[PDB]
Amino acid sequence: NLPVTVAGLGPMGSALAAALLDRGHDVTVWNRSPGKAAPLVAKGARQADDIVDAVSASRLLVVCLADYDALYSALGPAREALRGRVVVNLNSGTPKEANEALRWAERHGTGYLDGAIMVPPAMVGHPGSVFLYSGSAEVFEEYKETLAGLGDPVHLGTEAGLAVLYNTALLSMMYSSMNGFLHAAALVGSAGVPAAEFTKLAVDWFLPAVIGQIIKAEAPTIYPGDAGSLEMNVTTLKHIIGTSQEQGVDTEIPVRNKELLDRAVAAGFGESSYYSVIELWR
Amino acid sequence: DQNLPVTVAGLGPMGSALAAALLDRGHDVTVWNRSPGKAAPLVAKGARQADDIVDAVSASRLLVVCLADYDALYSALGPAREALRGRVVVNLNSGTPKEANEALRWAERHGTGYLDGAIMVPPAMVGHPGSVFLYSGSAEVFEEYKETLAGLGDPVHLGTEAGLAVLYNTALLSMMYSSMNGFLHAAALVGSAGVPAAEFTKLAVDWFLPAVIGQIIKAEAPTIDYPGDAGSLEMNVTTLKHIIGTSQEQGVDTEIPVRNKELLDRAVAAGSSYYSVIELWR
């Protein structure tokens, strides 16, 4: 039961469709290029002829396409068939793109959720999958159970752009953290330290016990316990850069991190908090 | 000997915490500091103050040193050359691994056992649950004093070579600085929409950091085996273009994601997995 249509059958859209099939939904699939539907049809999906049939088959339409232009092109022809259905858009962009899609959906009498997929395709549907959602709370509550088949659905608020905002923010932190980890791994690696054991120490202990706790301790709105003054952290970074040079590891990462603190010291004091670094960017 | 005499040389905020922790665990603690005015609070708690460094060293077989740098260690302890014979130095503030190896050499020249250690928590956490200290140096010396060292924090022995503790410490902290900075960009980005920092912080630290950042790191780490991974360099460039785009829309400085994207563009040109970025630095 709970018929669902998936539009877009790239690697992510295919995973969405397959996860929905595995929970036993009546899944209708649609894609622009041919040949992406066959593997899903084999697994029990009905392929729709035209986008109107696809949209008409289900009250819930899960969209996973390249951008907003792609969404309009794909779903534009559906016209009055969208009226009274719900679009769950899993591929915005930026928050302005999310708001543009909300506008498009509302013009067509269509409910709208914007979602960010927080795991790779292969994790979709499996324990650990988490999807962030923004949009009408009524709509979210009505389709929550269906959405749960893809991953733990977290509703951030009713404004269209929030999911993309949170997703882009979290991912920005992820890239920096991963790059720092790779500097770390290069550093120990240059002494011949085996990576597996260091990785486990860094991820299973240091990341939650030290990095997480220090972040919360620096957050002025939230361990006894903080990162210490800017000036003491500058000195720490000078030792990291020194160590990196000794070991023959590129100093780019700690050099940039030190320059950032130097800027924050100059704007405030050597005694200002670590968190005040954020004032350089807003 | 559960009340083993210990001397602490250096009574800055960390050294003072070490001394207080040792006093709480039933040691006869002798304290020393170059500048006056730091010993009195510890004397009140039961520490014996030493006049000069020779008296300090002569009072205990175990000497815990917590000074600014290596130069400070040599200048402080130099006069006590001879008194050091047959004692053990646990140096808790080497700046680089070459410095750790220099101090080993100095200690051994004088007939003195040597451990190097890195304190992984702030002063206020020292001697409380969650305190962790990393050690490197002679396994025999570590085994002999392990139980005393356990009073300060969980003692993790990395190996016998003098520089390992500094190497691991500098690596882990390098990752920390990058992670915190990426978090601050994240917080600025959601903050620019009026999202409250407390709730975002909790989501980022209590869920995203272990469930996503930690797992993606392990997935990329070729020696550890989350059926997915970070995806190709090229897909991550595109993701970063969206983060930069979102950051511009929101009026938040793009410095952090711009640098992260430039790194990947360098890695694409060198010519593939996210983890291969590491090859730019060694």
Ligand SMILES: C[C@H]1NCCc2ccccc21
């Ligand atoms: C350098 C100091 N300040 C930042 C927090 C921290 C955490 C672990 C070990 C040292 C430090």
